[PDB]
Amino acid sequence: FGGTDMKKAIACLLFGGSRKRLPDGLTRRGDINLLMLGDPGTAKSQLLK
Amino acid sequence: LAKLKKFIAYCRVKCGPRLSAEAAEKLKNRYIIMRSGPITVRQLEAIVRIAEALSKMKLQPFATEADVEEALRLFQVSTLDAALSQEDQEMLSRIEKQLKRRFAIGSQVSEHSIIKDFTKQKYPEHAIHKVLQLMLRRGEIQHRMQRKVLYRLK
Amino acid sequence: AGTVVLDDVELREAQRDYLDFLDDEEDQGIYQSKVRELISDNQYRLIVNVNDLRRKNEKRANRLLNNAFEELVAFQRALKDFVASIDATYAKQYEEFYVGLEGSFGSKHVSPRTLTSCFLSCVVCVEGIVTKCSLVRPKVVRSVHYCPATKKTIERRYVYPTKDEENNPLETEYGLSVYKDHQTITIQEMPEKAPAGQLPRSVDVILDDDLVDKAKPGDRVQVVGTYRCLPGTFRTVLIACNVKQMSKDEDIAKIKKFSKTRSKDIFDQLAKSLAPSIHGHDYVKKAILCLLLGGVERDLENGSHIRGDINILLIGDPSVAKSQLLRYVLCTAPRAIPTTGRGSSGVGLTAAVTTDRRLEAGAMVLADRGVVCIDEFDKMSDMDRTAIHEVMEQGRVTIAKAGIHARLNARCSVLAAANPVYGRYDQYKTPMENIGLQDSLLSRFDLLFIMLDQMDPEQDREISDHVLRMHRYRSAAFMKKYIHVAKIIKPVLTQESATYIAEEYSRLRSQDSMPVTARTLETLIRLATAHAKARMSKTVDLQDAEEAVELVQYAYF
Amino acid sequence: VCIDEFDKMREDDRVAIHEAMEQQTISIAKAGITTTLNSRCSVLAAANS
Known part of the structure; x- marks a missing residue:
């Protein structure tokens, strides 16, 4: 179950990006986060487990 | 099962890509067109972070233009997602104009029934919550007298 | 038990040595003059420099610093005897005299974080800011029945x-009984010295008589006393003996060369130094540089008058550097403490915490003589919104609770920001109510900038590039030293110089003929003074204030 | 972190988690506690809209 593109996103988060250690004050966020939505009634919550 | 986990963490220690000075300047020209189409400002910050993962996945010591092509595929889904199913006059004016200038009587148009009126204005009950709960902060004279006196004193 | 000690030799030796120390007969009588002064002024606590004690008898000082209780008692008795010798009647009036300690202590001058358990049963000095107090109740010390x-x-x-x-x-003789007052307060290390990584230390302070009103919540005080434990597990307390007050006032030669106007303009490059990774808003940057500087001390003895506590608000669109600018100031922030949003600890109030009575000084109180950075202004409750108004007007915070009445210093400035609730453009309606802030009291602020995402494609090209270049394959501390120098310089105004500046103030008012002007005379003074503070000049320059007028001119678009 | 029932969590932590997801650090909003733990964790938010 689940669309192909949705699975494509999942890998993108796990690898993650890079927090550039800026000498100049605060550094950069460098961290993406995903809000998982979609149609209910397909037991979606168990899938993400 | 466990073996596949460590491979993912393994690259995160290695590589550690950065922002390319020479390669980005040509890529920036693409963003200029992209910037034309708060949505726009957040986008570049968001996309760049995601693109950093692709370099990590392929041992890339810098960011290439092919990565941006992958970023387009992510935006393709988000394009429909932006519908949430742009206008300034529909938001604030419609609530203000029908408050007092429409109905001077004010009877039967209390807080318990004005929710029905919102139905005709194509406003869901969830959207009015952002409005109804914040009307006391607006400083409306009529709302505070109706809302606070009947809350406990009856 | 009732068993007694007959003529302890150590106590008698201590008494004789201390009396000889106080009997400044061969010298000019510095301490003897102080004793006369205290008798005349009706005060019964003599403060003695520890350095003199070292100079006259090193062994006495060493024993005092290593053993607190008995040595302090003996020295108190010596003071009583010396006062009685100088004047019997003054001694007869009072019951027991007390002695405080001042000066410099080599190893015992510690910070609350450094003040570990190892200094138990030794006299120590603690530096910090008061974070809680209680009301003044009397505790019985000798009851007669x-x-x-x-x-x-x-x-x-x-x-x-x-x-x-x-x-x-048994009906007690109250008159013959002796009651002394008592107060429990607590301390935190200074924000600039206490690391934000590890947990804070709190040390209890107990004040005896003649010290209940000497220190108030929110100031910074030095407490010296005996560090004991009231009764396996023991709670540490500090019985104080002297409290002073603080008054928040090697590279100087390096600084001086930077201040020469012959080489280059220091102000213009300095302004960009605070928001390194934010493109544009250069006028905004100049204002932010202004907020840090500026005078905050006037010769106000026993009263109050016009102050420099005026603050700058920032309103704009999300991700448009509105939220980030606060962080950049917060990082290289002199004497500044962060607080944001709700802050459910009484943002400007003591809240009178129960179930302990504690009076938890708030964010604006603990930030005296500094700058307060606040994010998500609209998140604050209406009570805070009502409360925060009173702080800026008179310059003080008033708290009225069940018996608890308090005076708090509020020598503070605010760098606040909030999102326009739901407004995205915010140009059709006047911001005075469109930014979610309800009262018209917004006019009290110094400035109100609007950073809308106007369709400006020419700027859009520069914004994209500026982000990417920042990797820096190939000057934070400089600004920190700058502010310290300007803190001891008062760039006094010259009316002859000011006149030319004031002439165009009307032209500022007349702009609407072709959002309050009546206060603008106030902000012109602070902004003009700020420009001179950058140049370390004691006199306001006509060119320096001219840029202040332009700052006002572009302040209202 | 895989947050489940994000809409069903208490608002008490919400007033704090907003900054944490942006500054990669959790803050303490008590009267005088300035301790800031390192909270660089990424967020996987799954909840019913």
Whole structure:
């Protein structure tokens, strides 16, 4: 179950990006986060487990 | 099962890509067109972070233009997602104009029934919550007298 | 038990040595003059420099610093005897005298974080800011009871004596009894010195008589006293003996060369130094540089007058550097503490915490003589919104609770930001109510900038590039030293110089003929002074203030 | 972190988690506690809209 593109996103988060250690004050966020939505009634919550 | 986990963490220690000075300047020209189409400002910050993962996945010591092509595929889904199913006059004016200038009587148009009126204005009950709960902060004279006196004193 | 000590030789030696120390006969009588002064001024706590004690008798000072209780008691008795020798009547009036300690202590001058358990039962010095207090209640120290039936009198030191030997009634002689006042307060290390990584230390302070009103919540005080434990597990307390007050006032030669106007303009490059990774808003940057500087001390003895506590608000669109600018100031922030949003600890109030009474000084209070950075202004409750108004006007915070009345110093400035609730463009309606802030009191602020995402494609090209270049394959501390120098310089105004500046103030008002002007005269003074503070000049320059007028001119678009 | 029932969590932590997801650090909003733990964790938010 689940669309192909949705699975494509999942890998993108796990690898993650890079927090550039800026000498100049605060550094950069460098961290993406995903809000998982979609149609209910397909037991979606168990899938993400 | 466990073996596949460590491979993912393994690259995160290695590589550690950065922002390319020479390669980005040509890529920036693409963003200029992209910037034309708060949505726009957040986008570049968001996309760049995601693109950093692709370099990590392929041992890339810098960011290439092919990565941006992958970023387009992510935006393709988000394009429909932006519908949430742009206008300034529909938001604030419609609530203000029908408050007092429409109905001077004010009877039967209390807080318990004005929710029905919102139905005709194509406003869901969830959207009015952002409005109804914040009307006391607006400083409306009529709302505070109706809302606070009947809350406990009856 | 009742067993007594007959003429302890150590105590008698201490008494003789301390009396000889106080009897400044061969010298000009510095301490003897102080004793006369205290007798005349009706004060009964003599403060003695520890350095003199080292100079006259090193062994005495070493024993005092290593052993607190008995040495302090003996020295108090010596002071009593010396005062009685100088004047018997003054001694007869009072019961017992107390002695405080001042000066510099080599190893015992510690910070609350450094003040670990190892300094137990030794006299120490603690530096910090008061974070909690209580009201002033009296605690009984010597109760005298008389029994009319048995014609006997019973006295007790420190379960209250209510019954005689044969349970007779006892009506206490209050007048013969002695009561001294008592107060419990606590401390935190200074924000600039306490690391944000590890947990904070809190040390209890108990004040005796003549010290309840000497320190108030929110100031910074030095407390010196005996560090004991009231009764496996023991709670640490500090019985104080002297409290002062603080008054928040090697590269100087390096600084001086930077201040020369012959080489280059320091102000213009300095402004960009604070928002390194934010493109544009250069006018906004100049204002932010202004907020840090500026005078905050006037010769106000026993009163108040016009102040420099005016603050700058920032309103704009999300991700448009509105939220980030606060962080950049917060990082290289002199004497500044962060607080944001709700802050459910009384943002500007003591809240009078129960179930302990503690008076938790708030964010604006703990940030005295600094700059307060606040994010998500609209998140604050209406009570805070009502409360925060009173702080800026008179310059003080008033708190009225169940018996608790307090005076707090509020020498503070605010760098606040909030999102326009739901407004995205915010140009059709005046921001005075469109930014979610309800009252018209917004006019009190110094400035209100609007960073809308106007369709400006020419700027859009530069914004994209500026982000990417920042990797820096190939000057934070400089600004920190700058502010310290300007803190001791008062760039006084010259009316002859100011006149030319004031002439165009009307032209500022007249702009609407072709959002309040009546206050603008106030902000012109601070902004013009700020420009001179950058140049370390004691006199305001006509060119320097001219840029201040332009700052006002572009302040209202 | 895989947050489940994000809409069903208490608002008490919400007033704090907003900054944490942006500054990669959790803050303490008590009267005088300035301790800031390192909260660089990424967020996987799954909840019913």
